[PDB]
Design a protein around this nucleic acid. Sequence first.
RNA 1: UGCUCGCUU
Lengths: 99, 50, 76, 48, 89, 34, 166, 86, 122, 97
Amino acid sequence: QGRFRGNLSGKRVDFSGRTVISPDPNLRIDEVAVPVHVAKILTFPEKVNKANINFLRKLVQNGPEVHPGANFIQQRHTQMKRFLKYGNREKMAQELKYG
Amino acid sequence: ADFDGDEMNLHLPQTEEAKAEALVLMGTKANLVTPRNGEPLIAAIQDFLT
Amino acid sequence: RITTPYMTKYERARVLGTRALQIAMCAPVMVELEGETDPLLIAMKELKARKIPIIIRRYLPDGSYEDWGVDELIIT
Amino acid sequence: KEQFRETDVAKKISHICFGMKSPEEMRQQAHIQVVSKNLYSQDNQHAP
Amino acid sequence: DLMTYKGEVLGITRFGLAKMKESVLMLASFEKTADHLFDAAYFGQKDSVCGVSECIIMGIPMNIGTGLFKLLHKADRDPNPPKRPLIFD
Amino acid sequence: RCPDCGSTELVEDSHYSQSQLVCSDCGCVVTEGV
Amino acid sequence: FVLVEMVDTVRIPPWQFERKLNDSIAEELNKKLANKVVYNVGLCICLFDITKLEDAYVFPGDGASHTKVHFRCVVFHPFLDEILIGKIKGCSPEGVHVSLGFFDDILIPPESLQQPAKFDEAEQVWVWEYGEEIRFRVVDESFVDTSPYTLVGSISEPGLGLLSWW
Amino acid sequence: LPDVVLKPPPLFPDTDYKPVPLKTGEGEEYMLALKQELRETMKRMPYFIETPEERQDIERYSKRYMKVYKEEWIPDWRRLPREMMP
Amino acid sequence: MEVKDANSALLSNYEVFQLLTDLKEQRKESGKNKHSSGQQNLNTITYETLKYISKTPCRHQSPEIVREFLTALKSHKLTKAEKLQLLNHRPVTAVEIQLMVEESEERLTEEQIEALLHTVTS
Amino acid sequence: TEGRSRDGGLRLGEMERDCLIGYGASMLLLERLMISSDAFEVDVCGQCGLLGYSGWCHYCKSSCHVSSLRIPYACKLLFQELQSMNIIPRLKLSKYN
RNA sequence: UGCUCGCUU
Ligand SMILES: *O[C@@H]1[C@H](O)[C@@H](COP(=O)(O)OP(=O)(O)OP(=O)(O)O)O[C@H]1n1cnc2c(=O)[nH]c(N)nc21
Ligand SMILES: Nc1ncnc2c1ncn2[C@@H]1O[C@H](COP(=O)(O)OP(=O)(O)OP(=O)(O)O)C[C@H]1O
Ligand SMILES: [Mg+2]
Ligand SMILES: [Zn+2]
C-alpha cells in the first residue's frame, strides 16, 4: 500500500464502475451492454462544435432525467460549471456557444 | 469469466485521443488472437460448438 | 525511405486521436460529413479518404528523422 | 508602460537530480521555526 | 538476450535488475525503496525520464507505444518567407 | 451568493455521490468536491 | 527604433488552420508584443518580419499547433545620445513631464543642467525666457512581479539656443 | 520539566564575553597601510585581468579619446608550455 | 522568449513608417472581430505611432532618396549615429547641425555645413 | 476512496498498467493515471529545482524562474516526503520542444 | 484513520 506501489503504479480513478456480468448472445463481439443507471452516472465531456451542435442542444433539452442527455455544462469563457437539474434547460441549450 | 457472480470493471475515457487509441489498439476485432502463440481466443464456446 | 512503407496501428491510433481532438476543437472538415456527430467517426472517414493534413515525423534511435504523409503511407 | 512577461510555458521535466541539503539550505527553505511541543491551545476552541 | 546482453547472465531478481537497469525511480519502486533512494541521494545520480516507469510516475507520455514518434501538421505555409529589405543598412 | 445571477438560493445537493453546492435558480455550480 | 531578433514558440488553436500559417503567426506575435516592454530591450512596437520558421509540431496535450518562429521586431530604444522631439504633457515642481507624441508618457527630464534660472512653481511654467527637443542620456528598466513603469530614461536639454522658440 | 517556549530563540543570542581589542602599535599600523596600498596597486597591475567588455552600442569619433590604454606584460613562453600562446 | 540581439541593426523612421502603413492597410483589408477584441493595444499603438511619424517631416521619402543621401554622406566620414539623426530630423537650418548634432568640434569645418544642407534638402 | 459504501472508485492495478503498456496506449494510460485520477498543477523554480507556491519560490526569494507544471498529486506527495527525508529531488525543467 | 474478521473473484 505504498506510494510507489499503492499510489503511483496502481491508483484509483473516477468515471468507472463495477458490476456483475450476464450472458447475452444477441450483441456483437465488439459490443458491450451498459445499464441505464450506470450510463446516467458515467458522463463524457463533449466539445460543442459545428457538427454535433444540434445533438448537444437536444441532449441539454432532455436533461439529466431522461437517459439521452447531459448533467453539467462548462462555458468556454468562464470555467464555472452549470448543473442542468436546475435552471431553464431550454435557455441553456439556446445559449450553447462553440467550444 | 464463467458468469457465476463475477464482478467486472467498466471505465469511460475522458479524452478523444484516449478513446481513439482504445478503439484502435484495444479493439476486440483487432485482438482476436493472443501474442503468445497467435492462437485465436475469441471463438466458439459451450452451447455453440454443440 | 528505409522504414516500412505500411502505416502501423500505433500511428493509425495516434493520428485518429489527434484528428478527433482537432475536430472536437472546431477544426475544418475536408470530407463533407453527412450527419456524423462523432469526432472519431469523422476522423476515421478522413483517414479512409486520405485527407488528414498530418505528417508523421518518424525518429530513428540515433537522432535522424524522416517525414511521411498519411496519403503517402499505406493503410489496411 | 507595461512590461513583457510570459504567462505560461509548456515546460517539460528533463531529469531529476537527487541530492542533499545543508542546515543552512534547510533554514532557507523553511518558513517558520517549530519549537512548541504541544499541538492545540488551552482554550475550548483547541486552536493550533 | 535481455538476460545475456551485458556478457553475464543476470537474473530477474532485484540484484540483476539493478545491475541491468539504471532508473533510480524504477529501482526504488521495485524493491529496497529507502535503500536505493538514499544511495541515489548520496551518489548524486541524476535520473532521466526515458523509462516507462518514471514516465508514468511523472505523468508524461511514455516513449514506447504511440509516443515513440512525433506528428507534424500539414498547414499551408511557406518556409523561409521573403524578408523585408533594409533601406538604411 | 451565486456568481452568475447573484441569487442566494445556494443548496447543497449531492448528485450521485458528488457533494455539490449549486444555485437553485440558474443551476450555476458554486463549489464541488470534498 | 531598432530591430531585435526573437525566437518564440507560438501556439495556434485548431480552428485557425484555414488561415495562412505565416499570417496567423504574424498576428499572434503582434498581439503578444503590442505595447509591452521587454527587459533590457525596450518597448516593442510591432513585428518587422519573420526570418526562419521551422516545422510545426502538434503535442499530445492541448492538441494545438506549436511553431518555433524566428523573427525581427521593431523596438524603441535610444542609443544614449539620440535626439527626439516631444510635447509637454504636464509639469511637476521637481521636473517637467514631457511625452513623445502619443507614444509614451514616460520621459522625465531632470531640471538640473539648464542655465541658472530653473524652477517649476506648479503653474505649468516651463522656464523663464532668456515641439520640445530632448537628448536621451541613459536607459533603465525594472521588474514588476515581486510578491506571490519599467522604462523612464533620463532626458537632457542643454543650451541648444533654440532660435525658433527661446 | 523543560518549560515550553512560545517564541523562537533570537537569531543572534547575546554573549557576556566580548572580543579582545586589536593589538596597537606602529608595526600593526604600517602593516595595515601596506595592505591597503597593495589592494590599491594590485588591481591596476596588468596581472589583474578584468572582465572583457562586449556589446558596444555604436562607434564614435571619441573612441580614440576614450580608448583605455594599458601596457601588457609578455609571459615567458620558454618556461610556459606552448598551449598558452595566443 | 529570449532575445538574441537588441541592437542588431539600426533603422531610420522611413522604414517604421512603411511598416506601419503596410500593417494598417493589411488590417483594414483583413479585419477580424475576435482578434481585434482580444487585444486592442495593437491598434492603438500602431495608429499613434503612425500619427507621430506623420507629424514628423518623415513624409515625402523613398528608398532611392535614402540611398542617395547615404551615398552622399559616406564621403563625409560621418558616423552612423550622426547620419541616422540627420535622416530622421531633416534639418533645414544650419544651427541644428552646428549645436544640436553631437561631435561638432573639428567636424563642421565651417565649409562642409553648406554641402550637408544642400544634400539634406536635395 | 476505496469502498463502495465510501463512494470509492475502481483501481487500475499494476496488472492493468502492465496490460495498457503491452497494448501501447500511451495517451490512454496517461489520461487514466494522471489526468482523471490525481491531476494537479504545481509551480517549480527553474533555478533551484524546488517546488513553489502561487508562482513564487521562497528558497530563492524570486519569481522569474517559477513555471507551472502538470504533475500527479501522488508524485508531488512523494517529492515532498523525499524532501522531508532529506533526499531533495532537483527538477531541471525545459521546453517541450 | 488503523487494523481485524468473514466472504465473491
Ligand atoms: O478517513 C476517513 C475518511 O476518508 C474521511 C471522510 O470525511 P468524513 O469523516 O466523512 O467528513 P464529513 O464531511 O462526512 O463529516 P463532517 O460533516 O465534516 O463532520 O474521514 C475519515 N474518517 C471518518 N470517520 C473517521 C473516524 O471515525 N476515525 C478516523 N480516524 N477517521 C475517520
Ligand atoms: N485468488 C484468485 N486469484 C485470481 N483469480 C481468482 C482467484 N480466485 C478466483 N479467481 C477467479 O475465478 C476463476 C477460478 O475458477 P476455476 O478454479 O477455473 O473453477 P473452479 O472454482 O475450480 O470451479 P469447479 O470447482 O471446477 O466447478 C478464475 C479466476 O479469474
Ligand atoms: Mg467465476
Ligand atoms: Zn528557487
